[PDB]
Write a protein that binds this DNA or RNA. Structure first.
Length: 367
DNA sequence: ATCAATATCCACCTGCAGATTCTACCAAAAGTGTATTTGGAAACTGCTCCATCAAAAGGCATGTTCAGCTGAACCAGCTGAACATGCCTTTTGATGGCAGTTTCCAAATACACTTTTGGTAGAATCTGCAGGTGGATATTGAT
């Protein structure tokens, strides 16, 4: 395979110590170094099963080794590494209560937000106590699909199966529930560097950029970006300037700050949507300009590589092409969800009925 | 090699809680009941040729009876191939979003009933003939 990297590494660091070379060149060199050491994540560290399929994933923001996960049957799990304290569990109905959105609480880490097929955007503890419901369908067969949160703004946002989005405060205060789309809202997210423009994606083959404080007039939006197929995810950058989008058939798109309408590059990659599989969500890496996605081969997709395996692919953002591929037998499932740690030293993967941890090996000999 | 105790097996019967689904109120709306009246379809009546009932009888083609005799049914048996049957593998099948069809609803369109004319394509009617139709004779293909 490819993975060639080269450079005059330490020199640049000293160049940075002299002021000659600019910081983005440093960021590029250490991005390459990060890829080189990610070539040693090949040894899969840990595996974890449980009951009904995995649907949503989330990282403990402050802690590297802690992670939370939510199932197809409303079964939530909280798991920490190097603890061995037999991780924490909570069950649900198990049939039609699929948790589908899951973000940690920025305030109380022993709390968590959740969006469920039951029709209940809730705030609940890992010990089982429901602290507070935020919204409700009040009529079954109409449920939520999307959820996200912001701490700098102290806001909650959630999306439906019909095309209307809801926006609440941390203490209630609902001033929202206007309709935005014609179909289900697959993903949604707020800017981390801003507080008052939003992004939402839907089955309508359109992804919309809103201004949550200015617009109130039922599709008096700010921007609307089209696509050729429906969209499973539209995720913001940490920096805030790059919006990543991933469709259902075969595509990834990078939109910029600079003219949201036009895209900067198209990254073709197979992640074909499917009914009983968990929907695929590309994701950023929090401290570089990389992209990470899970692959799902299609015999009809125009493959550039002659070898098409199920594996975790890692591309470069501002170029378009690939830079690394992680693969491990005994894990021949399809990695629906993949998310790097906010810390930057660990990767979590959610496959059907399985959760995988990929971190570096070392510790050749103890003393 | 039998019927007659027992090991084991499995249909039946029971008990109990859960799942399926029979049973049972209220709203929506196609669908069903009165009602008079018309003109096309049943029923009535004659008749009368055309089709059939009857039936007599006179050979004779055809049906009935007996002989006798070899090909057909059936049976003891019965090798060995063909296939049930368990017991383990292996393995494939049951359950667990969306696009692509299928379904309404108004408008716009196709085209098929309607009704008379009239000549004409086609059936009733008969008039000549040749392709059967029957008998008589010569070769042969099965015996």
């Amino acid at each position: 395979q490819i993975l060639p990297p080269c450079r005059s590494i330490v020199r640049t660091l000293h160049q940075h110590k002299l002021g000659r070379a600019s910081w983005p060149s440093v960021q590029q060199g250490l991005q390459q170094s990060f890829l080189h050491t990610l070539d040693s994540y090949r040894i899969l560290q840990k595996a974890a099963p449980f009951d009904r399929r995995a649907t949503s994933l989330a990282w403990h923001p402050t802690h590297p080794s802690t992670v939370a996960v939510g199932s197809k049957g409303g079964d939530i799990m909280l798991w920490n590494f190097g603890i061995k304290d037999k991780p924490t569990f909570i069950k649900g109905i198990g049939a039609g209560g699929s948790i589908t959105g899951l973000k940690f609480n920025p305030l109380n880490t022993n709390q968590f937000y959740a969006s469920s097929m039951e029709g209940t955007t809730r705030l609940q503890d890992f010990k089982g106590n429901i602290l507070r419901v935020f919204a409700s369908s009040d009529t079954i067969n109409i449920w939520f699909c999307s959820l996200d949160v912001s701490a700098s703004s102290r806001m909650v946002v959630t999306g439906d199966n019909v095309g209307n989005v809801i926006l609440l405060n941390m203490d209630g205060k609902e001033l929202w529930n206007l309709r935005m789309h014609k179909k289900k809202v697959t993903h949604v997210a707020l800017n981390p560097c801003c507080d008052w423009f939003l992004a939402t994606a839907s089955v309508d083959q359109t992804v919309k950029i809103w201004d949550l404080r200015q617009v109130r007039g039922k599709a008096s939006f700010l921007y609307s970006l089209p696509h050729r197929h429906p969209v499973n995810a539209a995720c913001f950058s940490p920096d805030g300037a790059r919006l990543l989008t991933t469709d259902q058939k075969s595509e990834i798109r990078v939109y910029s700050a600079s003219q949201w309408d036009c895209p900067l590059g198209l990254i073709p990659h197979p992640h074909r949507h499917f009914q009983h599989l968990t929907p695929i969500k590309a994701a950023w890496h929090p401290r570089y300009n990389l992209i990470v996605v899970g692959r799902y081969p299609d015999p009809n997709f125009k493959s550039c590589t002659p070898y098409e395996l199920r594996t975790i692919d890692v591309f470069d953002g501002n170029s378009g092409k690939m830079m690394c591929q992680l693969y491990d037998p005994e894990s021949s499932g399809i990695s629906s969800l993949n998310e790097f740690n906010p810390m930057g030293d660990t990767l979590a993967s959610a496959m059907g009925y399985h959760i995988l941890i990929w971190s570096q090996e070392e510790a050749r000999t103890r003393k």
